[PDB]
Amino acid sequence: SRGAHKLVGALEAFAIAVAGRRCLDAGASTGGFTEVLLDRGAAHVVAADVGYGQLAWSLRNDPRVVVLERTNARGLTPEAIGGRVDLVVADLSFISLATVLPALVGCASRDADIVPLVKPQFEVGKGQVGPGGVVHDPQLRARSVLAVARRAQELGWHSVGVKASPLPGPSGNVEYFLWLRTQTDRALSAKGLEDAVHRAISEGP
């Protein structure tokens, strides 16, 4: 799975433990993220079906998996998902993370990890997506990640790390995982985050 390969890259870069935790996959487009979380020992995964596409029946039938049928990731609540979770992962298309972060933060326990996949092609403004539907300007990709991190900090969630996804989008966009925590000993300073973003952008996938 391509979705599988990318999340493993994030999990290993950030050293986030999955075993025995309750998880939310906020845009379960593929079975990819859910499968990875189950393989790495998650106690429970809530897979939010937030659009077109149907999760495989082998997955929903799994005793560790619950599928939610929902309009919008924006509509997720801890009540709807059965309580706050320890790990939130989010691979969402055609929406800016700014608009959905409050919902994701609302579903997270205060010692949770929230790890969105920042997709510059849905964070930049009109005229800033280049030929082929790709953000070619590395400065704009960097500014996209920083803007999401700024919005997260406004909600009280600090940035702990940044990692380029190991696989570009199908049109070639490079995308970046952002590791967020509200309870942490290791929150990045502004300079720490700028350094992390510059390295991620320069390293690429």
Distance of CA 161 to the CA centre of its chain: 13
| Resolved by | X-ray
Write the Ramachandran bin of 94: left for phi over 0, alpha for psi from -120 to 50, otherwise beta.
left
Please, which residues have CB within 8 angstroms of residue 189's CB and are 6 or more apart in sequence?
A: none
CATH number for the domain spanning 92: value is 3.40.50.150
Q: Which residues pair with 134 in a beta bridge?
A: 130
Integer Cα distance of 198 and 202 in angstroms:
6
Resolution in angstroms for this experimental structure? 1.7
Distance CA 189, CA 191 (A): 5
183: left (phi over 0), alpha (psi -120 to 50) or beta: beta
Distance CA 26, CA 146 (A): 21
Nearest Cα neighbor of 75 from 39, 111, 51, 40 is: 51
Q: How many domains does the chain have?
A: 1
Report the relative pairing of strands 108-118 and 85-90 from DSSP bridges: parallel
CA distances from 188 to 85, 107, 143, 157 (A): 23, 23, 16, 11
Tokens (6 digits) for 102: 């409050």
* Cβ count near 171 (within 10 Å): 9
φ, ψ dihedrals at 136, nearest 5°: -80, -25
Written as six digits, the tokens of 42 are 């998650």
Its domain, for residue 50, covers 1-205
Query: What distance in Å separates the CA atoms of residue 65 and residue 168, rounded to the nearest whole number?
Result: 28
